[PDB]
Design a protein around this ligand. Structure first.
Ligand code: HEM
Ligand code: HEM
Lengths: 145, 145
């Protein structure tokens, strides 16, 4: 029910996503890496999916981790840019879901990214209001998994 | 090697990439789909790799094709944004190469995107000078396959 989940992205939710992304997306390498290292720190078990990245404890210094982290932020950039057209938002979200389904990543597992997002947002002084908005965007992806 | 190929992106090459992307990257959906449809038209042999997308001739109306096309443009956006730092450019290029290697896409196969890029650029009054600059960026990826 991707379209149904997209319906939860109301005018106010879209506004908070764009306002917070204006800051978070301004440093894709820095915030992308912070997002990943926080995920690994708070949910060590997720590291099992990233054996290809090697020594993730290296953080920013790990070229593969950095490459993945920056690339992840462009997926979010893609989503933010499509917010005003649900037909396009839905097709790019389903595109993203394809490889995650193949990796056998469930909606519950994918949702573990909510904690890291909440923390990265707070480090930039974006409170619960914004974290909730982001959880709603993540929920659109969860609906496709 | 990808490191030697990245070093081929000289000052003027980087500038021409930015100037042309300024225009082509303004309409990621339209130019992204144009890019893909041109690939399938001039190189029908490549269609086999995109079985999941379905009836590719539907163009913009094919949701999966549209989703793929928009997403492809954000990878180019990624590359353009990393031109300032060779180390970052290389790590995002190698990241992109991973799934293409898995699909057994060779450097020669990947290089078939040069024709479509040249044609999309030309439609926007960007000549050979620009097509050649983009061929050099594509060569960085080819070096990682
Ligand atoms: C905001 C959430 C997320 C976004 C936007 C996102 C985005 C992406 C993108 C764009 C890629 C590269 C293209 C691809 O191979 O599909 C990727 C790869 C991947 N993602 Fe996700 N992802 C997210 C969360 C997660 C989570 C929570 C997990 C697992 C617990 C996960 C596991 C993976 C894995 C294993 C890869 C491959 C990494 C590699 O070997 O390079 N992703 N993701
Ligand atoms: C400028 C050149 C290109 C760029 C930037 C690019 C980018 C991408 C991106 C971002 C994805 C989605 C993430 C992933 O699954 O890895 C993708 C998927 C894919 N690419 Fe590439 N690509 C390019 C050229 C090509 C070429 C020339 C071929 C084959 C002849 C190819 C075949 C594929 C296939 C089959 C998929 C999966 C499609 C699907 O099932 O949704 N790509 N590419």
């Amino acid at each position: 029910s991707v379209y149904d989940a997209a319906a939860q992205l109301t005018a106010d939710v879209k506004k908070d996503l764009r306002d917070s992304w204006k800051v978070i997306g301004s440093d894709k390498k820095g915030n992308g890496v912070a997002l990943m290292t926080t995920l690994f720190a708070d949910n060590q078990e997720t590291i099992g999916y990233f054996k290809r990245l090697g020594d993730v404890s290296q953080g920013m210094a790990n070229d593969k981790l950095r490459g993945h982290s920056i690339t992840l932020m462009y997926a979010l950039q893609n989503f933010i840019d499509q917010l005003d057209n649900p037909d396009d938002l839905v097709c790019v979200v389903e595109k993203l879901a394809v490889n995650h389904i193949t990796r056998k990543i469930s909606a519950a597992e994918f949702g573990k990214i909510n904690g890291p997002i909440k923390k990265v947002l707070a480090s930039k002084n974006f409170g619960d209001k914004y974290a909730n908005a982001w959880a709603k965007l993540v929920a659109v992806v969860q609906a496709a998994l």
